[PDB]
């Protein structure tokens, strides 16, 4: 059980780290989405302002 506790500690560490990685890649994606929305709003704003 001592070596099983060793393996448990290591597996728990790596599971927590791979669980954090999905939170991060999620933030990166949200970012990529919201910046695209901002760029598109800016583009349409330019179109209307220049047409005026």
């Amino acid at each position: 059980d001592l070596d099983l506790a060793k393996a448990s500690a290591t597996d728990q560490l790596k599971k927590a780290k791979a669980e954090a990685q999905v939170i991060i890649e999620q933030a990166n994606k949200r970012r990529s989405q919201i910046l695209d929305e901002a760029k598109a709003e800016a583009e349409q704003e330019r179109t209307k302002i220049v047409a005026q």
Binding site: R46, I49, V50
Partner: protein, 51 residues
């Protein structure tokens, strides 16, 4: 976007100014051609021969 609109405003203003420049100077040319007198040509030449 506003900077680009300012650039186009510059363009249009300069173009209008250049058209009025051409026509204004052509009108000045025709005026000087029709309205002239020997007492003025002699004055111009007498200003030239000064130097």
């Amino acid at each position: 976007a506003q900077a680009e609109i300012e650039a186009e405003r510059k363009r249009a203003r300069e173009e209008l100014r250049k058209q009025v420049a051409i026509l204004a100077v052509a009108g000045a040319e025709k005026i000087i051609e029709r309205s002239v007198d020997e007492a003025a040509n002699s004055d111009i030449v007498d200003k030239l021969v000064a130097e």
